[PDB]
Amino acid sequence: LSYAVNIVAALAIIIVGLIIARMISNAVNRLMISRKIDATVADFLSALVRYGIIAFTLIAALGRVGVQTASVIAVLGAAGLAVGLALQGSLSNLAAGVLCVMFRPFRAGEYVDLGGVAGTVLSVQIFSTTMRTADGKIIVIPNGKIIAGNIINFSREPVRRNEFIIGVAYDSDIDQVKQILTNIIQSEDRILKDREMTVRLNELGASSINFVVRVWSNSGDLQNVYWDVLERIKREFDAAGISFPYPQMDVNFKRV
Amino acid sequence: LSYAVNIVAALAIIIVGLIIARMISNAVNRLMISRKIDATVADFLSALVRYGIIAFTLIAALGRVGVQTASVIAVLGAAGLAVGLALQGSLSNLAAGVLCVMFRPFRAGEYVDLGGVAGTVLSVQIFSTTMRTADGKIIVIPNGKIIAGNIINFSREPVRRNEFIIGVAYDSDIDQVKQILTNIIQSEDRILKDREMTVRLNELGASSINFVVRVWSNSGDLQNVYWDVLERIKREFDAAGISFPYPQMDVNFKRV
Amino acid sequence: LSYAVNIVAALAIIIVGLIIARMISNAVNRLMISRKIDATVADFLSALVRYGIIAFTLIAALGRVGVQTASVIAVLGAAGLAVGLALQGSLSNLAAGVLCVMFRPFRAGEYVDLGGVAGTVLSVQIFSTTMRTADGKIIVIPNGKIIAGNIINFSREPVRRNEFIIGVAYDSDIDQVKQILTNIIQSEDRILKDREMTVRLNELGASSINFVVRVWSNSGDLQNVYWDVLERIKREFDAAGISFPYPQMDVNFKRV
Amino acid sequence: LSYAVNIVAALAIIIVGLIIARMISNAVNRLMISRKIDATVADFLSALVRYGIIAFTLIAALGRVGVQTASVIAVLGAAGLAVGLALQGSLSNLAAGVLCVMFRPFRAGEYVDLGGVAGTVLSVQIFSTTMRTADGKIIVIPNGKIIAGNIINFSREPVRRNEFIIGVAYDSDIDQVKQILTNIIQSEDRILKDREMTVRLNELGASSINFVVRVWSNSGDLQNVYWDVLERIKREFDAAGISFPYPQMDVNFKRV
Amino acid sequence: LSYAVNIVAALAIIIVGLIIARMISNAVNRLMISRKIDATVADFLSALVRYGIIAFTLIAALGRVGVQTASVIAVLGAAGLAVGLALQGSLSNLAAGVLCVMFRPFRAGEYVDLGGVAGTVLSVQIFSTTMRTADGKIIVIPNGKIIAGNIINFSREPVRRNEFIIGVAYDSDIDQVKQILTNIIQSEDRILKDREMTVRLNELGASSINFVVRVWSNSGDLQNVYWDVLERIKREFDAAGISFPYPQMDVNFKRV
Amino acid sequence: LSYAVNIVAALAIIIVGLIIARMISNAVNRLMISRKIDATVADFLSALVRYGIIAFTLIAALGRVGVQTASVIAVLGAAGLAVGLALQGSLSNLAAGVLCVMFRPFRAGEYVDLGGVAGTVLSVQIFSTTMRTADGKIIVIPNGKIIAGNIINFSREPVRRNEFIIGVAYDSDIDQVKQILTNIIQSEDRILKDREMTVRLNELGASSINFVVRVWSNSGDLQNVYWDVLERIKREFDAAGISFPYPQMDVNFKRV
Amino acid sequence: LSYAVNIVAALAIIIVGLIIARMISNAVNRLMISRKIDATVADFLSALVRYGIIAFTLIAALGRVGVQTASVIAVLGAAGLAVGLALQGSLSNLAAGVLCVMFRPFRAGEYVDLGGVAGTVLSVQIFSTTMRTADGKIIVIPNGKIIAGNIINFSREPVRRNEFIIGVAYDSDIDQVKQILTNIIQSEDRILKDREMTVRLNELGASSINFVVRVWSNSGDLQNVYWDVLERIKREFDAAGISFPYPQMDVNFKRV
C-alpha cells in the first residue's frame, strides 16, 4: 500500500494551503486598510483571495489522491453556486451598506423618507437600516431596498419652507387679506426675510377664495413657525372681520 | 469475466466513500459548532461537504465501471440543477430564517407589521414565521418575504406617543381650549412630562378648528392613556361650554 | 459488415441498462420510505436516480455505435432543458404541495385567506389546492402561489374576538352607555370573562360618539355571539332612551 | 477528387438518419399511447427523440465532411436557443393546456372567473382558452396565464347560496322583520331547508337597520330564487307596514 | 511565402460556402412553402440553416489561416449573443405575429379590447398591430404584448345582449312596471324572442327601486336597440304615470 | 534573449490585425449601405466584424507570447460581459430607435400618447425620444420604453370624432331636444355629413336626461368644432326654453 | 529543492506583470482622453485592460507553480462573478451617470420631474443625482432609475403656457365673459401675443359654466402671470356683475 502515502501528502497540502492562504489574505487587507480603501471592501476583497487560495489547495490536494481535477472545479462550482443563492440578498444588502455609509445620503440623526416610510435614522448596519418613526415605532429597512429607491432627506438642507393655504369668503377685501397676512409674516422674526415671501390670491375655490402664503425659515423653526403663524392668522382675521367660510350652497326652493 | 471484478470494486468505493464522507462532514460541523458559528449554518455548510465528498465518490466509483467521468459531472449537474429549482424558495426562506433569529429585528412576543399584515409574533421557523392578529387569526408569512420587506416593530422601543386630533367650533376661545387640554395632560401621571407635550391649533378646518395634542407615555400605557384622555376631553369640554361641531353648511335660500 | 455487431451490442446495453436502472431506483425509494422521509420526496429523489442511470446507459450504448459521447451529454442536455421549461411551474407547485401537507399551516376543513380569496379548505393536491367559498363557489389555487404568499388561518386558534363599534348621540350619558354595554356582555355566557372585556369611548365622531366593545368567545360562538349581542344593544339602548343618531347637519339660513 | 466521396456518404447518413429517426419516434409514441399517458405529452416527448436522433445524424454526417464535431454542437446549440426563445410562451401555454384538460378544474360549459374576467367556458385549445361573457363578448385567455392564476368555478358545486341585505327603518319591530323574512323563505320550496337559513339583524347602519338573510338553493335556482324572494320581501314589507327608509338627515336650523 | 496560399484558399471556402449556403436554404423553404407550413416560419427556420452553414464555413475558412477553431465558436458566440439581445423584443413580437394571423382570435375588422385599449383592428404586422379607436385615434400595440394578455373580441359572436337598469320610485306598482317594460321588448322586432328576456325587480336601492331588463339582439342591432328601447321606456313611463325619482332625503328639522 | 523576438512579432500582428480589421469592416458597411439596409444597422453589424477580427488578432498575438489561447477567450469573455451589462439598456434603446424611425408609428410632428404621457413629437434619437407637452414641458422618453408599450397616435388619421354629452331636465321635450341638436350639427359645415351623425337619448340620469351627440370632422377642425357647437347648444337651448338642470333633490320634511 | 526556484519565478512574473499592466492601461486612457471620448468611459475601458493583463499574469505566474491553468480561469471566474453581483447596481448607475452628463436631458439648475418626484437639479454624480424640492427637501435618485424612466423637464423650453379655468353662473352673458377675459389678457404685456390666446366656453358644468383661457408667456413670467391674471379676473368679474357661483341645488319640498 505504497500508494496510501498520497493520502498523507493530501493532508500536508491542505494544512500548508490553509495557512499559506490565511497569511496572504491577512497580508493583503493589511495593505488595503493602510492605503484607505474601506474596512468592509477590504475584508470582502481579502476573503475572496483567502477562499480562492484554498480552492487551489483543494484542487491539487485532492488531485494527488486521484480526484480528476476537472471534477473538483465542478463540485466546488456547484457548492459555491448553492451558497451564492442562499446568500445573495445578503451580498446585495452588504454592498448597499457600504455605499450608504461611504456616501451619507443620509447620516444617523437625519429624518428621511425611504420609500413610503419615514423616520429618524438611528444606524446603518451590515444588511439593514434602523429608523424611529416620529411616534416611536421602529422600522428595519433592508440596505438593498434603500439604495435602489429614492432617498428623501428632510434634514440635510439648513433652511426650509412652510406653505399656508388660507381660505376666506368671496366678499372679503382682497387687498385687506394680503396686508394682514403680509404684516403677520413681516413681524415674525423666525421667517427669513431675504428669501421668498409669497402672499397671493391662488385659487378661486368651491366656497372660498384661497390665498397661498409661502415663507422660509431655519429647519428647526419650521414646525413652530407654522403653528404660531396659524394661530395668528385665525386671531387677526377674526378681530379684523374676515370670515373663514363654512361650506356653501345655493338652494333653489320648489313647493310641489 | 475478469472485467466483472470492477463491479465489485465500484461498490467498495461507494461504501468507503459514503462512510468517509459521513465522518468528515460530521467532523467538520463538530468544529464549527465548537467555535460558535450557528447551528443551522453549520448543518448547511457541513451537508455541502457531505454531498460533495459522495459526489467525488460517485465519479471515481462509476469511473471504474467505464462511465466516462465527464458524463458523471454532467448527469449529476442536471440532477442537482433539478433539485435546486424545486427547493430554492425553501433555500431562500431557510436563509431568511437564520438572519431573523440571529438579528432579532423582531423577537417572539413583539407586535409587528410585516408588510401590510400585523400581529404578535409567536415563532420563527425554518421557512415561515407565525404571528397572531390582535383578534385571533393566525398568519403564516414566509421568512423570505419578511426579510426583503420593511419590518415595523411596535414593541422594541420602550416609550411611545399618542396623537389626539380634537375639533372644536370656530367661535371657541383659542386660549381656553389650549388650557383645558394642557391641564388634562398635565394631571395625567402616565404621560411622561420630560418629553414632548404639544397642545396646539393645527388646522383651520372644513367645519371645525382642529387642535393637535401629542404626548408620550410608556409603551404599556399608550392604549389606556389614549382612551382615558379622550373620555376626559369630551367631559371637560362639555362642562366648560366648548362645542364639538356637527358638519356645517351655510344655505342661501331662493324662492323660484 | 462485422461492425454491424455493435448495433446489437447497443440494444443489449439499453435493455440491461433500463432494467438495472429500474431496479436500483425501486431499491432506493424502498430504503427511503422505510426510514420515514416522505412518499413524494421519495418518488421524486428516486425518479432522478432512475432517469440518471438510463442517462448513463444511453451514453455508453450509443457510444458503442460511435456517437462521440460528448454529443450525447449535449443532446440529452437540450432535451432535458426543453422538458425542464415545459414542466417547472409544475415542479414548483409539486414542491409547494409537499411543504403544505408536511407543515399543515392550514389543514383540510380550516377556513383560510390565501391572498385575497378565502374559503374552507377541501384538499391539497399535486399542483393545486381546492377551497369552497362560504357561498358555494369553488376556487382552485396553485400550490406555488399559496406557499409564497401570506397564509391567514381563521380556524387553527380556538378562541377569537369580536369588535363592536356602536355610535350614540353626543348628548348621551357616557357612564350610562358604558354600563348598559358592560351589563350586556357581563350576562352573555358565551363571552369568555377571563379575557379582554373592553367597553370604551373610542372616537369623537362626525355625527356620533363612537364606543368600542371588544370581547372574546370560542371560535364556534363568535358569529352568533356578535349577532345576539347586537340585537341586544339595539333593544336595550332604545328602551333605555339612548339614540343611535342619523347623520347630522347644522344649516345656517340666509334669505337672499 | 476521391475525397469527394465523403459528400455522397454524408447524404446517405442523413437520409438513413432521417428515416431511422422518423421510425423510432413513431414507434415510441405508439408505445406511450398504448399505455395511456396523454396524446399531447406523447407527441411532445416523442418529437424530442425525433429531433434528438437527427441531431446525432447531423453531427456524424457533417463530421465525415470535416465539420469538427464540437462546432456542430455549438451551431445547433445556438439554432435551438434562437428557436427556444421565439417559442417558449407557446411551450408554456402548451403545457398549461395539458394540465387544464387533464385536471378539469373547469370543464367546457362551466361558468368561471379566470383572474378578473369571467364567462362560460367553450373550449381549451393548444395555447389559449375561449369563454363567452354572459352578455356575448368572446374572451381568449392564454393557457399559461390561466394556470398560474386562481381559478374560480361557479358551477362545479351543485348547491349555492344567496345573501340578501335588507335595510328597514330604525323604529321597525325587530321581531316582526325576522318573522316576515323567515316566513318568506320558509315557504319558498326552492330554498334547501336542511341547510343554513340565517335571518338576522346584522348592521346598525347609517340610516337603516340592516338585516341579513342567507339561504341555500340548487345552483340552477339561485338566480330566480333571489329575484322572487326580493319581489316578495318588498311586497310583504309594504303590506305589513315596514318602511325601507330613504337616506336620513337631522338638520339643525339657525336664522343668522 | 508558400504559406500565403492558405489566404487564397480561405477566400475560396468563403465564396463557395456563401453560395452553397444560399442555395440550400433557398432550396429548403422552397420545400416548406410547397407543403403548407407558413411563409414566415419557413423564412425563419430557413434563415437559420443559412446562417448556420455560413457559420461552419467561417470556422473552416478561418481555420486554414490558423484561427484555432475554438476561438471562432467563441467570437461568433459573442457576436450572436450581442445581436440576440438587441433583437429579441422583435423576435418575440415576430412570433406573436405568426400566432395571431394563424389563429385569428381577432381578424381585421373586428372590434376588440387588447388589455385596456379597444378599437377596430386594421392590420397585424411583423411586430405590431394597428387598431382604430371608435373616435379616430390610431393605436399601435406590440404583437408580443397582445398575445400574453387577454383578448376580448366584441364581434366574433353573432348575437349579443343589452342590459338596461331602470330606477323607479318606491311607491310605483311593481306589476305595472314589469308589464310596460315587458310590452316594450315584446313588440321590438330586433329583440330575439327565442333567447333570454329578463324583466325583473333587481335592487332595493338608495332612492329608487331598480329594475333590470336583459334582452338579446343581433350584434349589429345591439346599439340602436338600446337607444330605441330607452327613449321608449322614458316615454311610456311618463305617459303611464311612473316616476323616475330624483335623489331623495328625509330631513328632520330642529329649531335651536 | 532570442525568445524576446516574439514580443516584436506580437506587436506586428496587432498593428496588421487592427488595420486588416478596420478595412474589412469599412468595406462591409460600404456594401450594406449601397444595398439599402439602414445606416445604423450597418454601423452596428459592421462594428461587430471589426471587434471580432481584433478579437482573433488579440488571441493569436498574445498566443505568440505564450498566453495559453483558452485564457484569452476567457479574459475577453469577462471583459465583454462587463461591458455588455454596463451598456445593454443602451443597446435595447438603440434598437428601439431604429424600429421607430423605420416604421414611423409616429413621425416627428404628430401628437401621441406614449404610455401615460402625451405630447407633440420632436425627434427620435439614438436612445431617447423628445416630445413637447401641449403646455410647453419637454419630456424625454427612452426608446426602449416606447417600443414595448402601446403607441396612441392622435394625428395619423385624417378625420376624427367629437362626442358631446348634454344633460337636460326630465320634463324637456325629447323630440325638441333631438331637433335642435340635429339642426345645429346639420348647419355646421365643418361636420362631415357623409359620416356618423348620432343625436340620441343615451342615459336616464341622476338629475338629468343625458343626450349623446357624436359627429365627425377633419382632424384640424375637431377642437374648434367642439367649442363652437357647444356655445351653440347652450345659446339655442336657452332661447328655446330647454333647461340644463342643477343637481336635484326631493326633501321630505319632518318637524320633530 | 531546485523546484523551489519556480516560487521565485512566480513572484517575478507578478511584479513584472503588475507593472506591465499598470503602464499599458495608463498608456491606453492617455490615448482615449487625447481623442475626446469621456473621462469616465476612458477610466472604465482602461481599467478592464489593467485587470485583464494582471489576469493573464496570474494565470502564467501560478502556472509555473503547477496550478493547472484551467483552474485559474475557474477560480478567477468565480471571484469575478461574486464581485460582479455585489457591484452591478453600481455599474448600471455608473453608466446612467455618463449618459446623463453626456446628453444633458436635464442640466444642473433645471426643474424636472424624475418619475413622481420633482425638484431643481443640483448635481449628477457617479451613481446618484441630487435635486432640491421647491420647499427644501433633498432627494437622492439613483442614476439608473432616472435613465430608464421618463424625464420631464420644466425649464429647457424658453416659453410656456398657463391654463385658467374660470366658472361663472349659467345666466351670465357668454359674450361679456369672453370680452372681459380677452381684454385682461390683451393688456397683460407678459403674455406673448404672437402665440395661442384661447378664451372660450369649454364645459357646461355641474353648477357653473366653465370658461377656459390659455395664454403663453416666457418661462420666468409663467408663475406671476398666472397669479396676476387671476386676481384680475376676480376683481373685474365682480365690478362687472358676473357671479362665480357657489354649488347649486334645486330642492323639491314635500310635507309628509
PDB file of C-alpha atoms in Angstrom, chain G residues 66-151:
ATOM      1  CA  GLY G  66       1.793  23.894 -11.085  1.00  0.00           C
ATOM      2  CA  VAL G  67      -1.641  25.499 -10.780  1.00  0.00           C
ATOM      3  CA  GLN G  68      -3.231  23.640 -13.729  1.00  0.00           C
ATOM      4  CA  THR G  69      -4.150  26.845 -15.792  1.00  0.00           C
ATOM      5  CA  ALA G  70      -7.823  25.756 -16.293  1.00  0.00           C
ATOM      6  CA  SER G  71      -8.303  26.036 -12.529  1.00  0.00           C
ATOM      7  CA  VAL G  72      -7.197  29.690 -12.515  1.00  0.00           C
ATOM      8  CA  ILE G  73      -9.693  30.593 -15.258  1.00  0.00           C
ATOM      9  CA  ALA G  74     -12.254  28.889 -12.991  1.00  0.00           C
ATOM     10  CA  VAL G  75     -11.343  30.375  -9.607  1.00  0.00           C
ATOM     11  CA  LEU G  76     -10.901  33.899 -11.054  1.00  0.00           C
ATOM     12  CA  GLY G  77     -14.134  33.360 -12.976  1.00  0.00           C
ATOM     13  CA  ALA G  78     -15.928  32.755  -9.680  1.00  0.00           C
ATOM     14  CA  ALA G  79     -14.144  35.622  -7.927  1.00  0.00           C
ATOM     15  CA  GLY G  80     -15.101  37.998 -10.731  1.00  0.00           C
ATOM     16  CA  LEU G  81     -18.637  36.655 -10.704  1.00  0.00           C
ATOM     17  CA  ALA G  82     -19.009  37.282  -6.928  1.00  0.00           C
ATOM     18  CA  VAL G  83     -17.712  40.857  -7.340  1.00  0.00           C
ATOM     19  CA  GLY G  84     -19.890  41.303 -10.426  1.00  0.00           C
ATOM     20  CA  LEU G  85     -23.055  40.641  -8.452  1.00  0.00           C
ATOM     21  CA  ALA G  86     -22.100  42.766  -5.485  1.00  0.00           C
ATOM     22  CA  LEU G  87     -21.359  45.747  -7.755  1.00  0.00           C
ATOM     23  CA  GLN G  88     -23.799  45.676 -10.767  1.00  0.00           C
ATOM     24  CA  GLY G  89     -26.435  48.080  -9.379  1.00  0.00           C
ATOM     25  CA  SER G  90     -23.453  50.377  -9.186  1.00  0.00           C
ATOM     26  CA  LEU G  91     -22.172  49.531 -12.682  1.00  0.00           C
ATOM     27  CA  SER G  92     -25.679  50.225 -14.027  1.00  0.00           C
ATOM     28  CA  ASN G  93     -25.870  53.536 -12.144  1.00  0.00           C
ATOM     29  CA  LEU G  94     -22.323  54.442 -13.234  1.00  0.00           C
ATOM     30  CA  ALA G  95     -23.355  54.067 -16.867  1.00  0.00           C
ATOM     31  CA  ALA G  96     -26.560  56.069 -16.440  1.00  0.00           C
ATOM     32  CA  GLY G  97     -24.314  58.731 -14.906  1.00  0.00           C
ATOM     33  CA  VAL G  98     -22.261  59.052 -18.058  1.00  0.00           C
ATOM     34  CA  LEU G  99     -25.305  59.114 -20.336  1.00  0.00           C
ATOM     35  CA  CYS G 100     -26.961  61.873 -18.233  1.00  0.00           C
ATOM     36  CA  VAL G 101     -23.894  64.155 -18.243  1.00  0.00           C
ATOM     37  CA  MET G 102     -23.156  63.480 -21.928  1.00  0.00           C
ATOM     38  CA  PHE G 103     -26.736  64.074 -23.145  1.00  0.00           C
ATOM     39  CA  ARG G 104     -27.943  66.703 -20.665  1.00  0.00           C
ATOM     40  CA  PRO G 105     -31.664  65.795 -20.892  1.00  0.00           C
ATOM     41  CA  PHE G 106     -31.559  67.878 -17.788  1.00  0.00           C
ATOM     42  CA  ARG G 107     -28.655  70.104 -16.728  1.00  0.00           C
ATOM     43  CA  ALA G 108     -27.838  71.333 -13.234  1.00  0.00           C
ATOM     44  CA  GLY G 109     -30.332  74.076 -12.328  1.00  0.00           C
ATOM     45  CA  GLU G 110     -33.296  72.907 -14.395  1.00  0.00           C
ATOM     46  CA  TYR G 111     -36.525  71.956 -12.591  1.00  0.00           C
ATOM     47  CA  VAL G 112     -37.520  68.421 -13.581  1.00  0.00           C
ATOM     48  CA  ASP G 113     -39.874  65.528 -12.692  1.00  0.00           C
ATOM     49  CA  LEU G 114     -37.929  62.259 -12.433  1.00  0.00           C
ATOM     50  CA  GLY G 115     -40.775  59.768 -12.086  1.00  0.00           C
ATOM     51  CA  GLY G 116     -43.163  61.113  -9.447  1.00  0.00           C
ATOM     52  CA  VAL G 117     -40.659  63.334  -7.645  1.00  0.00           C
ATOM     53  CA  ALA G 118     -39.720  66.761  -8.942  1.00  0.00           C
ATOM     54  CA  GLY G 119     -37.126  69.288  -7.883  1.00  0.00           C
ATOM     55  CA  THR G 120     -34.361  71.580  -9.066  1.00  0.00           C
ATOM     56  CA  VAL G 121     -31.336  69.531 -10.113  1.00  0.00           C
ATOM     57  CA  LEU G 122     -28.131  70.208  -8.197  1.00  0.00           C
ATOM     58  CA  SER G 123     -25.556  67.669  -9.370  1.00  0.00           C
ATOM     59  CA  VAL G 124     -25.322  64.333 -11.182  1.00  0.00           C
ATOM     60  CA  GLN G 125     -22.712  62.070  -9.538  1.00  0.00           C
ATOM     61  CA  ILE G 126     -21.196  58.598 -10.099  1.00  0.00           C
ATOM     62  CA  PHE G 127     -24.308  56.616  -9.046  1.00  0.00           C
ATOM     63  CA  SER G 128     -26.868  59.154  -7.853  1.00  0.00           C
ATOM     64  CA  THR G 129     -28.441  62.523  -8.702  1.00  0.00           C
ATOM     65  CA  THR G 130     -29.362  65.196  -6.208  1.00  0.00           C
ATOM     66  CA  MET G 131     -32.311  67.596  -6.541  1.00  0.00           C
ATOM     67  CA  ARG G 132     -33.929  70.101  -4.187  1.00  0.00           C
ATOM     68  CA  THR G 133     -37.707  70.139  -3.852  1.00  0.00           C
ATOM     69  CA  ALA G 134     -39.298  73.584  -4.173  1.00  0.00           C
ATOM     70  CA  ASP G 135     -39.847  73.504  -0.373  1.00  0.00           C
ATOM     71  CA  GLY G 136     -36.310  72.451   0.684  1.00  0.00           C
ATOM     72  CA  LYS G 137     -36.281  68.673   0.951  1.00  0.00           C
ATOM     73  CA  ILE G 138     -33.292  66.991  -0.726  1.00  0.00           C
ATOM     74  CA  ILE G 139     -33.898  63.924  -2.869  1.00  0.00           C
ATOM     75  CA  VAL G 140     -31.253  61.468  -3.964  1.00  0.00           C
ATOM     76  CA  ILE G 141     -32.284  59.430  -7.006  1.00  0.00           C
ATOM     77  CA  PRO G 142     -30.218  56.581  -8.449  1.00  0.00           C
ATOM     78  CA  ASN G 143     -28.815  57.372 -11.913  1.00  0.00           C
ATOM     79  CA  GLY G 144     -30.089  54.007 -13.103  1.00  0.00           C
ATOM     80  CA  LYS G 145     -33.676  54.666 -12.097  1.00  0.00           C
ATOM     81  CA  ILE G 146     -33.616  58.097 -13.784  1.00  0.00           C
ATOM     82  CA  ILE G 147     -32.377  56.912 -17.178  1.00  0.00           C
ATOM     83  CA  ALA G 148     -34.990  54.121 -17.590  1.00  0.00           C
ATOM     84  CA  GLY G 149     -37.863  56.373 -16.625  1.00  0.00           C
ATOM     85  CA  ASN G 150     -39.429  59.387 -18.319  1.00  0.00           C
ATOM     86  CA  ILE G 151     -37.625  62.724 -17.864  1.00  0.00           C
TER      87      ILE G 151
END
